[PDB]
């Protein structure tokens, strides 16, 4: 089997991407944030504290003839930005772009933090990291991909995120028309539950490539590119007037600037992030200070190849017995 679904930016800055997902019988379609940096499929629901729902579409398990309470199971998750959610668990039928999993754990939110409430466009998350990170207790649950894998034509999914435009998540096949040149594969460590890999270095603009190992995670659920302070400083030093602002919480730059590209290595291959991908616009409405899309990972404890990096590539998440990651230009 295979599946294919379009993923769409939630706003003009590509702050996140949403993908429609069918849950239950009859189908209830919710727009979920596909997140290769976590492993829970959770949704706003009829159980979510009413004051914490503001415009989201909810899953109502009592209206699904295939929903079953997973007795005794609860979940609770916190993300890298300090947001969180928790609740109980149902199993139900879940379909993505024509690919159907029966008995998928659908984690129903009883509580969500303010960042989720305030984002009317995201109805929940669909985790695509390794199932070892799933938070359901006392019986850990499998991700949608893990459940689908054995049925797929090939045990893979691909992320093809657009810059200020829709893109695609495919399950079970590699669309050879969706990228240019060849796909370069690179080793993955699953030890921390992430799609963790080692980039071979970087360049800033038309500058020379610096060969240096950068361990990090491929994380579609993180907006920006978080890299070591040395790398980030080298980037922003090429932008007149750019500075790190403690009050704003990262590097900012004059909105009048033309940003240089940023290249990262995948083995001997190179992915080029155009400068415009690194512009996240005014820090506040009407400001001439703009927020940078490349930020320091210092104090995160891990480097993160988030959407800024991933959207410059066609990315293969290969879930074979020994997982790997593939990157192609597009």
Domains of the chain and any CATH numbers: 5-174 (2.40.70.10), 175-330 (2.40.70.10)
Give, in degrees to the nearest 5, the angle at Cα 63 between 60 and 65. Answer: 125
Q: Which of 35, 40, 88, 123 is catalytic?
A: 35
Q: Which of 38, 199, 296, 297 is catalytic?
A: 199
218: how many CB neighbours lie within 10 A of its CB?
Answer: 26
- The enclosing H or E element of 235 equals helix 229-236
Answer yes or no: 35 catalytic.
Answer: yes
d(CA 205, CA 189): 30
d(CA 34, CA 221): 7
Q: Could you tell me if 19 and 7 are in contact, meaning their C-beta atoms sit under 8 angstroms apart?
A: yes
Listed resolution, Å: 1.2
| Residues near 236 by beta carbon (within 8 Å), at least 6 away in sequence | 242, 243, 244, 251, 253, 292, 294
How many residues are there in the chain? 330
d(CA 151, CA 145): 10
d(CA 101, CA 94): 5
The sign of the torsion formed by the CA atoms of 297, 249, 32, 17 equals negative
């Amino acid at each position: 089997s295979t599946g294919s679904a379009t993923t769409t930016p939630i706003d003009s800055l590509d702050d996140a991407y949403i993908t429609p997902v069918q849950i239950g019988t009859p189908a209830q379609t919710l727009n979920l944030d596909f997140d290769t940096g976590s492993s829970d499929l959770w949704v706003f629901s009829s159980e979510t504290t009413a004051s914490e729902v503001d415009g989201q579409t909810i899953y109502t398990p009592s209206k699904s003839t295939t929903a079953k309470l997973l007795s005794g199971a609860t979940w609770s998750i916190s993300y890298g930005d300090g947001s969180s959610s928790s609740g109980d668990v149902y199993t139900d039928t879940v379909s993505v772009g024509g690919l159907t999993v029966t008995g998928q754990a659908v984690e129903s939110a009883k509580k969500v933090s303010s960042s989720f409430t305030e984002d009317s466009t995201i109805d929940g998350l669909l985790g695509l990291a390794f199932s070892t990170l799933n938070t359901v207790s006392p019986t850990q649950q499998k991700t949608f991909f893990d459940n689908a894998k054995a049925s797929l034509d090939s045990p893979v999914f691909t992320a093809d995120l657009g810059y200020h435009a829709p893109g695609t998540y495919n399950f079970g096949f590699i669309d050879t028309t969706a990228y240019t040149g060849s796909i370069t594969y690179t080793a993955v460590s699953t030890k921390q539950g992430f799609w963790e890999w080692t980039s071979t270095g970087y360049a800033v603009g038309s500058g020379t490539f610096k060969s240096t190992s950068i361990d990090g995670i491929a994380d579609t659920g993180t907006t920006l590119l978080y890299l070591p302070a040395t790398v980030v400083s080298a980037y922003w030093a090429q932008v007149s007037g750019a500075k790190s602002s403690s009050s704003v919480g990262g590097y900012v730059f004059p909105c009048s600037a033309t940003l240089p590209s940023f290249t990262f290595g995948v083995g001997s291959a190179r992915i080029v992030i155009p400068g415009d991908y690194i512009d996240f616009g005014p820090i506040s409405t009407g400001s001439s200070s703009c927020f940078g899309g490349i930020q320091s990972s210092a104090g995160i404890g891990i480097n993160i190849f988030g959407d800024v990096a991933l959207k410059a590539a066609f990315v293969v998440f290969n879930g074979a017995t020994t997982p790997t990651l593939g990157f192609a230009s597009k």
